[PDB]
Design a protein around this ligand. Structure first.
Ligand SMILES: NC(=O)c1ccc[n+]([C@@H]2O[C@H](COP(=O)([O-])OP(=O)(O)OC[C@H]3O[C@@H](n4cnc5c(N)ncnc54)[C@H](OP(=O)(O)O)[C@@H]3O)[C@@H](O)[C@H]2O)c1
Ligand SMILES: O=C(O)COc1cc(Cl)ccc1C(=O)NCc1c(F)cc(I)cc1F
Length: 316
């Protein structure tokens, strides 16, 4: 299987990338350096992760060392919810570019479909704990994203955590100039996303699977939640293939024509997670993994559930 997938902007995107949410700022520079040294060419970032400066130090060092050329890297970031307004989008993108020490992003995503009140706080709340919306809509935010392409700041634009109706709304936008290249969504054997993936793929939108290992370090994990990495059924498939459970969990979305972005700051795991191009899951393995769906989400957030554009009320 090829290492990159063709996007609807004509550029190629590596199907395996390194995630950076929760990567501590004192560890992520080395994580990204190691990743690039062992073959990663795609890094998934976001302003809200609060570590783009440190990610950028690694990228810049590897560019300066001439380990890789800029054209060989595929750097992704995301516009946070408090920057959905027309007059804030460019500055938000530029702050990310400055922190990452880049002059363009390969892909810039609307992180969530919901706009929040601008200000210092990433999650502005009312006194009862509800997020405070902005009156921005996904269509006007999209137009602002299109401007970034036309200004040379980003090579591609896309969306993240958009449900099927929201994807449809973008595709049906009056005067749409650029289609979204990517929809980045949670996807793993407990949240298999058949409906939304089929819709996006049918429209030429590439899907990136986040939390492919079930995000065991998510800060709201409860001791009781289901655990992909410990599921004996998945362990059995891994054993059959002489691979680790994580390697199976990474290979799974790859064979569905998805991009996948496992996170690690552990050098041995960063390397392990990349060793997924020399084995194949059978069709029976794939269908068996799909059968584990339980509609379980890592990424949901009560404080945001009443926002008009919160994505997870719809079935898909
Ligand atoms: N667009 C969005 O809204 C959104 C939401 C969630 C995630 N994402 C992106 O997707 C990335 C991945 O998702 P995620 O961070 O939620 O979780 P994940 O990649 O599913 O899991 C990361 C966890 O798995 C551990 N791990 C990594 N490789 C392992 C291995 N080979 N064996 C055992 N454990 C391993 C990591 O530990 P160590 O790091 O300690 O090694 C970390 O605790 C994020 O970092 C972010 O870039 C985007
Ligand atoms: O959104 C991500 O990329 C990962 O999740 C988070 C990352 C940070 Cl730095 C802070 C918060 C979260 C988080 O709570 N994510 C879940 C979440 C939202 F942040 C925002 C919405 I709108 C819905 C939702 F489920």
């Amino acid at each position: 299987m090829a290492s990159r997938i063709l996007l609807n902007n004509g550029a190629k995107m590596p199907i395996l990338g390194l995630g950076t949410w929760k990567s501590p700022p004192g560890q992520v520079t080395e994580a990204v350096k190691v990743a690039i040294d062992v073959g990663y060419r795609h890094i998934d970032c976001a302003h809200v992760y609060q570590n783009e400066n440190e990610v950028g130090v690694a990228i810049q060092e590897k560019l300066r060392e001439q380990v890789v050329k800029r054209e060989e890297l595929f750097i992704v970031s995301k516009l946070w919810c408090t920057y959905h307004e027309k007059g804030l989008v460019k500055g938000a993108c530029q702050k990310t570019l400055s922190d990452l020490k880049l002059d363009y992003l390969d892909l810039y995503l609307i992180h969530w479909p919901t706009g929040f009140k601008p200000g210092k706080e990433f999650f502005p709340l009312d006194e009862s704990g509800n997020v405070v919306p902005s009156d921005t809509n996904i269509l006007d935010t999209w137009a602002a994203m299109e401007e970034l392409v036309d200004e040379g700041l980003v090579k591609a634009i896309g969306i993240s955590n958009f449900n099927h109706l929201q994807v449809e709304m973008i595709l049906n936008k009056p005067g749409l100039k650029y289609k979204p290249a990517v929809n980045q969504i949670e996807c793993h054997p407990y949240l298999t996303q058949e409906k939304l993936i089929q819709y996006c793929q049918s429209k030429g939108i590439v899907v990136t699977a986040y939390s492919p290992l079930g995000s065991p370090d998510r800060p709201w994990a409860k001791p009781e939640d289901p655990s992909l990495l410990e599921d004996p059924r998945i362990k059995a498939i891994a054993a059959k293939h002489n691979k680790t459970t994580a390697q199976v969990l990474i290979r799974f979305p790859m064979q569905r024509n998805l991009v996948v972005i496992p996170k690690s700051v552990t050098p041995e795991r960063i390397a392990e997670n990349f060793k997924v191009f020399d084995f194949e899951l059978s069709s029976q393995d794939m269908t068996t993994l799909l059968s584990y769906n339980r509609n379980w989400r890592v990424c949901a957030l009560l404080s945001c559930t009443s926002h008009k554009d919160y994505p997870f009320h719809e079935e898909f």
